[PDB]
Copies of this chain bind each other. A is one copy, B any other.
């Protein structure tokens, strides 16, 4: 089950911020949810979908967009 974290909604189309591979906090959204392994597919706004990434929904590298 997705965890209850402030400012974040674990839903496809939900907006948040994630820390990218270049160690930059950038605006992102949830493209898909893997309820079995507890992961969220993250898409960094205006990036090649080649760099979309799966983050454990408990990752501290995810934060509210506000």
Contact = CB atoms under 8 A, between A and B. Distances in A.
Interface residue SS majority, chain A: loop
Contacts of A48: 46-48
A59 interface: no
Interface residues of A, number: 12
A5 interface: no
A26 interface: yes
A41 B24 CA distance: 22
A20 interface: yes
Interface of A: 20-22, 24, 26-27, 44-48, 51
9 contacts: A20-B46, A22-B27, A22-B45, A24-B27, A26-B26, A44-B46, A46-B48, A47-B47, A48-B48
